[PDB]
Amino acid sequence: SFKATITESGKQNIWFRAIYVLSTIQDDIKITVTTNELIAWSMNETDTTLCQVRFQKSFFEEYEFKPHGVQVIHKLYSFRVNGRHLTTISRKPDGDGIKSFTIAVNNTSTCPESLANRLIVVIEMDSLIVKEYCPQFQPIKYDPINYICCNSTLLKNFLDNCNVNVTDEVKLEINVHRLSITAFTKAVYGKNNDLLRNALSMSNTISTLEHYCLFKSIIFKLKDFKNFITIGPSWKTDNISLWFCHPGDPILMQMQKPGVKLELVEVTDSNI
């Protein structure tokens, strides 16, 4: 039915990094096949974060799809695949580059049990070595203010300078004069005012930014923001969009690529 092939380098680095991030978010990555795009998404167990990566048909050399599991809305075949398993197939080996990365599923009467509920991914190295994999998949059903347009790299350096174990929450205080974000963690006080957990408040300020349309204070997690931030800077050829409304409302993070759509939704702190 569906068959997609990637035959470029940066096109493969962005795919591998997106798959790695979606595997870090949830154990099983969610992939849906459309006739015009490839939607790979993943949601946390707490249902607080949702990262979705959309690969258009122009991102692949060939994007055959014959739907004639399946769910009509336009037909849509969705399936579940293990993230830790797909992140090693798409891993770029050291010493032998990838020439053609083909991903396909053949759920037809012509297919035997080797292709029944098992995804087909083809890797052809530049050394002509052909590596075959058959990851098992499970059919499923798809489950589908102020504006900030800051530069991704200025965020990138500070975010990489933040450890997830010692810093968990990020504050984003947007002002018309300047925008300062601070990666902080709170302190937990014990029985006799004992320090169960410390408080680190590493911070950085970026002067006001391109499209700081306020038309504030927001708090959300950090372990997925860093990953979604470093997804895009893998296809070297870089502006992130922050759409948040209220403390209790989710924040939307979007990035752009020539053939890749990046979306991240996170639940924000309802504290006012």
Binding site: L196, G248, S270
Partner: protein
Amino acid sequence: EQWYEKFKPNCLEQVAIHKRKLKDVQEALDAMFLPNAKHRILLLSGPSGCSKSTVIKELSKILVPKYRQNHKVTEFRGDCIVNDLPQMESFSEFLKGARYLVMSNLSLILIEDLPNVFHIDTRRRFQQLILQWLYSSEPLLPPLVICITECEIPENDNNYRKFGIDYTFSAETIMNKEILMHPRLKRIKFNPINSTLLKKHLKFICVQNMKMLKEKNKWNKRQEVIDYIAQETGDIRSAITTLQFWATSSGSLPISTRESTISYFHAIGKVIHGSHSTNNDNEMINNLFENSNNLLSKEDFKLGILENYNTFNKGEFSISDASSIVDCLSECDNMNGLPESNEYGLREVRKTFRNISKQGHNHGTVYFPREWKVRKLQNSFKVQAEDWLNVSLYKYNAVHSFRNITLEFGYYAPLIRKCQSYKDVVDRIGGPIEA
């Protein structure tokens, strides 16, 4: 599907739970959904198949869509292994994202699949992460419900390093006293399902299978099998599974349910007063050793026998019987924990209490041994004696052995120092001696 999955309750009236227990769970849960609740965590503890989560889910179904500031629970999945996360950090990232499940995103977080607590480091991490939630400074936090099933850990890990978690999977051996005696933690212990509710629910399931029951000529003997299952087990899931297995059968295979483990005080009472099921002490003792060897081998059981054998008739039996019991226990203590030692001590205690047993005996209440209190007072004595020794080393250059301390230094030395001060420790080492 299976009858315990297809005949699951739809509302709270179909849940096999006691009325008072349901009332105490309901009021506590309703109180924990208030803006600033006094209780932060609700620890439900009890045996398996006691509707501990089967009541939490159907209570959340009517509670969460009442306080959601515009419907179900968020359960922790321990088996989830994500790419970039240490295994011990899996619960931390769950509790760090679950705390965002507050107003307009409200969800009761239920922890029934506990993390791996048989490994010490992650058990300690679990404890300190719960303590970081009880002592959290967040103005608003979601209600947290933790269900722990009390089950005896079977005989494994032949190392002598068996800890409490290596003997019994209970809230006492998973949590610590700081969590268990916290002002913001509410514990509601659950009891096994009584015979009446089990009978009523197994009869509702039968009238929902009446056609198939009658076709296999099993509809008049349904009363006896429901009664036998209700009398034999207190597990609703096991009861429904056994009923389904008996109904779908077409032969005379015998009704067999799961096996339950006795309590420590239950085993003590069985040794002392005997069991009503059988009047043969040999059979009862053999079954107790076969099914509960993990408890009859611990020395605290032989200590509990010595602590509670005086409760047979409130202490009104012959001194010869008590002397025989304690002499047998002392002789068993010299057998180096052989399997023949406990099997002789318990048999002798039961034989002694059987002959003197008469009708109308008003027995007493058993208690746990105080050996641990003595062992902690011994450590306090050690600390105070070493304080005496080191404070009596530089002021007056002198060495003295601890054996001489426990005989003449702690009554005489304070009696000299306080008498020299009535005109440097001055108190009796280890506190005064009473009686």
